Design a binder for this molecule. Structure first.
Ligand SMILES: *[C@@H]1O[C@H](CO)[C@@H](O[C@@H]2O[C@H](CO)[C@@H](O[C@@H]3O[C@H](CO)[C@@H](O)[C@H](O)[C@@H]3O)[C@H](O)[C@H]2NC(C)=O)[C@H](O)[C@H]1NC(C)=O
Ligand SMILES: *[C@@H]1O[C@H](CO)[C@@H](O[C@@H]2O[C@H](CO)[C@@H](O)[C@H](O)[C@H]2NC(C)=O)[C@H](O)[C@H]1NC(C)=O
Lengths: 54, 153
């Protein structure tokens, strides 16, 4: 359906609002959108091995 | 390369330490420890922040791209179009997954090097009067108070 918010990215499955560099929803974009890929999990570690003490 | 400190000769981490990633644990005449080391963790935070911001800013944003149309007599160009789009899609997803899978061991070995260097510093400026015992501790042949604790730190 059609509604009246205002975004900067548009896909056939809805609109996107993010600043991440990658994207998963649909490979046809209008506006300024992050890059479409074909993966599921791109978690990136900033920290240590969580090793608890016994 | 695993430098040997995290889950190595040092046992697992500390729950009670809060405000950092690298700290000390003193047991002087009047208290217990769990105080951070704000020098080395600051360089760690700045390095990882520059790392993540660089990885963000290298990937360019894509502009408008709309699928096209063809009649029944231009199947050749349409197959060429589909080959182009799938080839670029495979190259980009390969580069993304490979970049993350190298960056993870890079940052874990970075933390391991930070632990080992912070241990070598404390050992090197306590060259005799320390009596190391195991898993990163020292036992102080002389007497020490909070002043010489911060003098170590
Ligand atoms: C790193 O740690 C050393 C530990 O020796 C620091 O030196 C000590 O700094 C404290 C800061 O409060 C000084 O304590 C007070 O100084 C005033 C002014 O003389 C005095 O009125 C108090 O009675 C008390 O002594 C202390 O004098 C000073 N020195 C020693 C031998 O403890 C040092 O400042 C820290 N920072 C750096 C960048 O080195
Ligand atoms: C898109 O998402 C961003 C990030 O959440 C939104 O930015 C903030 O959103 C909160 C809650 O809506 C607001 O209180 C802040 O004022 C927003 N910050 C700024 C700088 O605007 C943003 O509002 C979202 N936009 C849309 C159209 O959904």
């Amino acid at each position: 359906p059609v509604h009246n918010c205002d975004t900067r990215c548009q896909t056939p499955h809805g609109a996107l609002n993010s600043s991440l560099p990658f994207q998963n929803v649909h490979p046809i974009t209008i506006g300024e959108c992050p890059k479409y890929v074909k993966s599921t999990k791109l978690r990136m570690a900033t920290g240590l091995r969580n090793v608890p003490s016994i | 390369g695993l430098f040997g400190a995290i889950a190595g000769f040092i046992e697992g981490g500390w729950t009670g330490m809060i405000d950092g990633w690298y700290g000390y644990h003193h047991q002087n005449e009047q208290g217990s420890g769990y105080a951070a080391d704000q020098k080395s963790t600051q360089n760690a935070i700045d390095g990882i922040t520059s790392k993540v911001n660089s990885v963000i800013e290298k990937m360019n944003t894509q502009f408008t791209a709309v699928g096209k149309e063809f009649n029944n007599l231009e199947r050749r160009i349409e197959n060429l179009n589909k080959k182009v789009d799938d080839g670029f899609l495979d190259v980009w997803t390969y580069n993304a997954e490979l970049l993350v899978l190298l960056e993870n061991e890079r940052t874990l070995d970075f933390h391991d090097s930070n632990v080992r260097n912070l241990y070598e510093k404390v050992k090197s400026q306590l060259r005799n009067n320390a009596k190391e015992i195991g898993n990163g501790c020292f036992e102080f042949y002389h007497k020490c108070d909070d002043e010489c604790m911060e003098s170590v730190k």
